[PDB]
Design an enzyme around this catalytic site. Sequence first.
Site, short mmCIF file in Angstrom:
data_model
loop_
_atom_site.label_atom_id
_atom_site.label_comp_id
_atom_site.label_asym_id
_atom_site.label_seq_id
_atom_site.Cartn_x
_atom_site.Cartn_y
_atom_site.Cartn_z
N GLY C 20 0.84 -1.23 0.00
CA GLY C 20 0.00 0.00 0.00
C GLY C 20 0.86 1.26 0.00
N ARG C 24 7.41 1.83 1.13
CA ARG C 24 7.76 0.41 1.25
C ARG C 24 8.15 -0.17 -0.11
NH1 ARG C 24 3.12 -2.99 3.03
NH2 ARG C 24 3.16 -1.43 4.71
N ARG C 43 1.39 11.30 -8.50
CA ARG C 43 0.74 11.30 -7.19
C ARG C 43 1.63 10.73 -6.10
NH1 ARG C 43 -4.99 11.96 -6.90
NH2 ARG C 43 -5.75 12.85 -8.92
N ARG C 87 0.07 -8.64 -3.88
CA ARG C 87 0.00 -7.59 -2.85
C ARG C 87 0.86 -8.07 -1.67
NH1 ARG C 87 -1.67 -4.16 0.82
NH2 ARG C 87 -2.75 -5.00 2.70
N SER C 90 0.30 -5.15 5.02
CA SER C 90 0.21 -5.41 6.45
C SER C 90 -1.24 -5.83 6.77
CB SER C 90 0.63 -4.17 7.24
OG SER C 90 -0.20 -3.04 6.95
N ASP C 204 -0.49 -5.24 13.55
CA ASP C 204 -1.31 -4.72 14.66
C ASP C 204 -2.07 -5.91 15.21
OD1 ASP C 204 -1.64 -2.51 12.24
OD2 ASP C 204 -1.43 -1.62 14.25
N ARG C 217 6.72 -0.69 9.78
CA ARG C 217 5.90 -1.08 8.64
C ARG C 217 6.59 -0.84 7.30
NH1 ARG C 217 0.33 -0.75 11.20
NH2 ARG C 217 0.85 -0.33 13.40
O1 LIG Z 1 -13.70 10.26 -14.21
C1 LIG Z 1 -13.59 10.27 -12.94
N1 LIG Z 1 -14.16 9.32 -12.19
C2 LIG Z 1 -14.04 9.34 -10.82
N2 LIG Z 1 -13.30 10.24 -10.16
C3 LIG Z 1 -12.62 11.19 -10.87
C4 LIG Z 1 -11.83 12.27 -10.43
C5 LIG Z 1 -11.49 12.75 -9.01
N3 LIG Z 1 -10.47 11.88 -8.50
C6 LIG Z 1 -9.14 11.86 -9.13
C7 LIG Z 1 -8.64 10.49 -8.64
C8 LIG Z 1 -8.88 9.41 -9.72
O2 LIG Z 1 -8.20 9.78 -10.94
C9 LIG Z 1 -9.49 10.14 -7.42
O3 LIG Z 1 -8.95 10.73 -6.21
C10 LIG Z 1 -10.86 10.74 -7.68
C11 LIG Z 1 -11.46 12.92 -11.60
N4 LIG Z 1 -12.01 12.32 -12.69
C12 LIG Z 1 -12.74 11.26 -12.26
O1 LIG Z 2 -6.33 -2.57 11.97
C1 LIG Z 2 -6.31 -2.56 10.70
N1 LIG Z 2 -7.46 -2.41 10.04
C2 LIG Z 2 -7.53 -2.47 8.68
N2 LIG Z 2 -6.40 -2.60 7.91
C3 LIG Z 2 -5.17 -2.74 8.52
C4 LIG Z 2 -3.88 -2.94 7.95
C5 LIG Z 2 -3.39 -3.10 6.51
N3 LIG Z 2 -3.40 -1.82 5.83
C6 LIG Z 2 -2.54 -0.72 6.28
C7 LIG Z 2 -3.36 0.51 5.85
C8 LIG Z 2 -4.13 1.16 7.01
O2 LIG Z 2 -3.24 1.39 8.11
C9 LIG Z 2 -4.29 0.01 4.77
O3 LIG Z 2 -3.59 -0.01 3.52
C10 LIG Z 2 -4.60 -1.46 5.08
C11 LIG Z 2 -3.03 -2.98 9.06
N4 LIG Z 2 -3.75 -2.87 10.22
C12 LIG Z 2 -5.07 -2.71 9.92
#
Ligand SMILES: O=c1[nH]cnc2c(C[N@@H+]3C[C@H](CO)[C@@H](O)C3)c[nH]c12
Ligand SMILES: O=c1[nH]cnc2c(C[N@@H+]3C[C@H](CO)[C@@H](O)C3)c[nH]c12
Lengths: 237, 237, 238, 238, 238, 236
Positions: C20, C24, C43, C87, C90, C204, C217
Amino acid sequence: TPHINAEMGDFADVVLMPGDPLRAKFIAETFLQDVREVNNVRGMLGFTGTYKGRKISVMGHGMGIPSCSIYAKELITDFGVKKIIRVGSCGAVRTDVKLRDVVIGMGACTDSKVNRMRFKDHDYAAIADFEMTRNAVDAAKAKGVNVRVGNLFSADLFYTPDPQMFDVMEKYGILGVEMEAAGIYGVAAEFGAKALTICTVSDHIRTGEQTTAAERQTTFNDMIEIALESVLLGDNA
Amino acid sequence: TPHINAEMGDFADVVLMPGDPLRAKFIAETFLQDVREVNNVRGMLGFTGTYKGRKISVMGHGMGIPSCSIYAKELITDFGVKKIIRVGSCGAVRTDVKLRDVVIGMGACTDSKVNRMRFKDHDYAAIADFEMTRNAVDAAKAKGVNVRVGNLFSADLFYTPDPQMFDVMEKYGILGVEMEAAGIYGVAAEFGAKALTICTVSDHIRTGEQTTAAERQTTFNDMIEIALESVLLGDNA
Amino acid sequence: ATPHINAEMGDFADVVLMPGDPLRAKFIAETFLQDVREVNNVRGMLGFTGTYKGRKISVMGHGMGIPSCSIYAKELITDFGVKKIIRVGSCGAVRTDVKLRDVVIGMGACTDSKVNRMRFKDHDYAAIADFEMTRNAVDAAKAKGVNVRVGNLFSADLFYTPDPQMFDVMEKYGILGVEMEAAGIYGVAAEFGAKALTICTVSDHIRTGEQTTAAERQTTFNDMIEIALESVLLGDNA
Amino acid sequence: ATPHINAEMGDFADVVLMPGDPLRAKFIAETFLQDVREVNNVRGMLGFTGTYKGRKISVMGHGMGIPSCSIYAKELITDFGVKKIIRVGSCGAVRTDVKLRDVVIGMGACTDSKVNRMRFKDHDYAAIADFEMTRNAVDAAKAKGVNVRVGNLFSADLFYTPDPQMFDVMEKYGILGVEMEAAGIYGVAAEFGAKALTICTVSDHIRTGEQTTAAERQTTFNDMIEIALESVLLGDNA
Amino acid sequence: ATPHINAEMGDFADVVLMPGDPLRAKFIAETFLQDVREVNNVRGMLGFTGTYKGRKISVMGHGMGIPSCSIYAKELITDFGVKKIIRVGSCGAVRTDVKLRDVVIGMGACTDSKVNRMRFKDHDYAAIADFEMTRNAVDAAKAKGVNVRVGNLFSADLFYTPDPQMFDVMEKYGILGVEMEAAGIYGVAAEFGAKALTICTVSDHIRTGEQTTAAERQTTFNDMIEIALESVLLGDNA
Amino acid sequence: PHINAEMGDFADVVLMPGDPLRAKFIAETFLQDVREVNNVRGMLGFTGTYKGRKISVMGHGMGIPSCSIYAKELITDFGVKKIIRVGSCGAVRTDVKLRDVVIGMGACTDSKVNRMRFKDHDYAAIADFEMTRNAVDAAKAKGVNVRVGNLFSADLFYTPDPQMFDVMEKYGILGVEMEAAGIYGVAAEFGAKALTICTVSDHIRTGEQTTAAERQTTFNDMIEIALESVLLGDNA
Ligand SMILES: O=c1[nH]cnc2c(C[N@@H+]3C[C@H](CO)[C@@H](O)C3)c[nH]c12
Ligand SMILES: O=c1[nH]cnc2c(C[N@@H+]3C[C@H](CO)[C@@H](O)C3)c[nH]c12
Ligand SMILES: O=c1[nH]cnc2c(C[N@@H+]3C[C@H](CO)[C@@H](O)C3)c[nH]c12
Ligand SMILES: O=c1[nH]cnc2c(C[N@@H+]3C[C@H](CO)[C@@H](O)C3)c[nH]c12
Ligand SMILES: O=c1[nH]cnc2c(C[N@@H+]3C[C@H](CO)[C@@H](O)C3)c[nH]c12
Ligand SMILES: O=c1[nH]cnc2c(C[N@@H+]3C[C@H](CO)[C@@H](O)C3)c[nH]c12
């Protein structure tokens, strides 16, 4: 239709709608000049008159989403209505909301399935028109009436089998429980018009404090002044 | 927390949040004075500085409801944040909405289950705070930026298996499709804070027009001027 | 040409490991791979391609939550010809017999997301891994002498859940870890005709509050990565 | 005793093969086991115990559909101490590349039943087989020279579905066979802390309309039984 | 020629009594009909045709649960010309005023199955009996001197329910008996344009814990059979 | 808030149309010694005698949420044992015609109300059996042809999903109205009895429609059947 025995032209472009046709009569007779009765099918009284020279209608919508959805749909599609302002009552779940407070529903939550039916079973956010909401807030300020603006909850069962839901509503800041706003907002979006719900708190669901049927029919006047003045503000913006 | 490596006080009481942490970096560097980086865990950059003397933070929230819900919750409960303004992008479905238009989500529809999980599987109307919305509309008027105010649709699948739903969104006047607002509004209500989403149209789902990654990162600046000026309006009662 | 990935076809290997956390991914690439190139940074979602024991391998962050990872997984498959996604995540434990740093393999992933309902006419889609990738991971763990458990994950939409009682239901049903992504990645892999597996390290314990640091992590969950990389070699050779 | 099983504790082995059809259970017992005794006949739901290559094994019908098989599977686990259930079923194919008499292994089972939603707070429970049992079946198939596919089944409530378009969705998502039970068996196994696997033989093709006879389903699907029985021996030996 | 019924058109009467238990079907046919012939035995699901007071009648098991009985009910209607099905079942009582061995008539059937939602665009389909068949059964009961209650059944998918609190809800709403089939049979009868009714005998009391034996269920619930058979004769003569 | 009457003002049996003006017509036309007992919100209710037997009639308004309020309060607050809804409905079947009378042994719905009562399962919203039989027998005695079966209680008259009418037709739905499933749920919840009888006022496919005046004052068959059915129930 089976529901409205008026001719086109009989309604103004703005209609105030309480649930109670007898409150619609009281409103028209008390606030408007040159009033004519324009609907009475099923006893669902509607009237048209003027407020400070501006044409305004007032018509009951009955209780609950399915009833008000019929009248609101027909007013928009068959009578050219542009704005509906529901002028309702509601029950308070929040301990900081009191009897006779006026609340403005910028949004309306609901336990009805009607908006799921419109929106492929997703969450439709049933919202008022922004400018109508602003107009109402600004009108309340000019009249010196305190208002809160936020979410209503439009319930299908007044006599709910799940009173614990009230605690959820309260946690999420719901200002008042009524039975119509989410429905009116869904119709307004569906058929391309504008709506707003303003309600006066008639019942406290936590304390049991209540108003009489007479009070609900003829005594919730602050909300009507706000509603009418908000129309004028919307015209002149 | 595992998501934010900052101390209480590092964030202002108001945080602007784009989904893109690089857009957060650009916003801070371009619009704020005396900027410091206050978060970088998982690369989710957050900054704090001043805008016209007023303390303001800007931090990425990532894409989608589950991501932004984590950050919004923590800023509210752990860092005392009172207002969040999401400053996002969105995809247009309406023929009258153009690339680069700025839209203000007074409500946010969604196909996520998160608000159903909060709200006993009923319809929670995911709405912005009214005064923050009014502040944004007023700031746009003052900045000479055209805006539309109404419903967003926060989607879980950018690559949706149901493109026909766009037709439904269009029919119901949805101003922009994004992936966050409904989740941010749900968190704000749950934990007793205030939020608003303002987005810039980056894609048109009907015309096929798209902006580049670079344009999304650094060129949607009208929404930022509106957001920052709206904060000052809010402070001045 | 996509808003999410600024790479060209060819830049990714046919197998991509995905944590994620983009930091990492950076640590994994720099620690485990040779001749590494950064291939994405839009991003801040860092991605890299190098080799492991001579085999091309990519590693790229997918962000937190189903809607985030769904975008990246979809694009890798349709736009960059990725055949396999592993994937490397964690997760939070709910079972009394699952401990911090245990490695768990998600043959299935339950979820409270609506995304698979949207794909599958509102019925129950069993979000499952590729069987051979799962077997390859179990076998690679055996060869390394690292204990694994194989079973169901639960991919949550709300880390801060309004329904903590659900953890009890998860525990009763034997859920090995709670994360936020597997069921989404599995749904995308099935939709777009590729293969996926989620392996997670317990970071966790949800019942007790036992926690690893952000630094732990980001740089310290190595057994799962060795297992993932060795499992790819097993899959090539089968 | 319960209304459904008139046997004594000890009458069942720790492993039970279960076809939907009690007459197939009779066929399996007569054809593959030695020293057979009938141990259940309430409601005609024939069950038997004997030995395969010296190892105690039981075989008992579970009837058609999730509600029927849920009752038998629960009782075997909680009342007769059964540890592993291998459903030995038939299924209908939706893919062009899946043919009559092919054997498929259900590492997961999708469903249009509400039963796992009732167990799992209306969320998506991924109804999965036990991993090791699945691996044992795949390995046994390889040793028997029988081609298998391993993946998702779809456990329908309505054989005569009002929504045949759903088969197109199933096919898109790679569903290997349509049957009516696996997702229910997998839910029970998890609920009551036992292990299960479903292996099916393709008895109908939903696209071409080709159907095996009742007699062929009852006494001719040998490959899946040989695979199931040999898979048990693999599981015994680690 | 179906996989489930090995009979020819004409082998079944236009009215079929159906218990869940094929051995009860055999007992009913042998005890109450003349000139009986067995007309189905696929999957052990015995069906018979004979005469009652000179009138041709069939009796055949439908198995346990909505998915099982839905297959047999559909085929009888579409493939064998059956016009009426009378389910002659057992049920569990939740009301304090309903006793073991009471006969209940299901003019409606609630359910926690998803089958009627699948037929009815996920709305609430009121699964009801045919009115005249219901009237005929009430009137036959009066003529036979057998006390009955007429109202709602509840057709459960899980006998071993994870939600026993729902029994309290059923009781509040006056549910007369919990069984596993009626809502499904009524849904099929409506879908395919035939008529059905479920009459049940109370075999368990969910609150007091009283339970009848397997033998009692198979052979002693006979008031309901007398009502069912006499109700057919009334229906003919209207 | 909804009923301005005292205990005892309603008979143990109440006929309920959605339209309070139809309630007024029924009382004026079919009952003797009538008095008006409710008028809050214009929701007129009356009590009189039919052939000497005490009977009330009161409007319930349109839709499940409106009628659920009145039906509940009548049962719990006014001791009402039987409610007979005397409604209109729209036909979807080719063999159901304007002015036909239909009896809802069951009522399907697209409302969430019974899901809210029944842990999100399917509650079969049914009438009382004996009331149903009484109505069928009364119809036979009056020489009025009736069909007995499922109604469908809709929440949206102006439905966004007109294809559902095809599904209703397939499944034999006799008429579309907006109330029965809600009244049946309230009756079960609070331990009373109810039945819905409707006259077809619209054909949803053909577009045939009766006037508002026709709905208000000409649907006599269903009223005669309802009132005679009560007398059969008293005497059985
Ligand atoms: O065509 C679309 N569908 C859904 N979300 C977005 C967005 C807004 N954002 C941008 C980003 C996905 O590109 C996510 O954070 C939601 C821009 N264009 C679209
Ligand atoms: O307590 C938890 N609840 C749900 N997801 C996670 C995870 C795994 N991840 C890490 C991250 C949120 O911390 C998201 O990408 C899912 C670690 N601990 C927990
Ligand atoms: O306690 C309440 N629950 C639900 N709605 C209301 C209302 C508002 N109305 C009034 C009326 C029900 O009394 C219906 O039109 C909705 C006032 N109090 C309550
Ligand atoms: O075409 C099919 N649809 C659904 N299930 C099956 C099965 C599996 N079984 C066999 C049996 C119905 O024939 C029921 O136990 C489920 C074989 N063919 C099909
Ligand atoms: O307690 C009960 N729960 C659900 N169904 C039944 C039945 C009726 N049957 C009998 C059989 C399960 O034993 C299945 O066909 C439904 C009797 N008792 C109960
Ligand atoms: O076409 C229709 N759709 C839904 N309901 C009705 C009804 C019965 N009513 C009459 C009234 C709406 O006109 C509401 O109380 C339900 C008559 N025609 C139709």
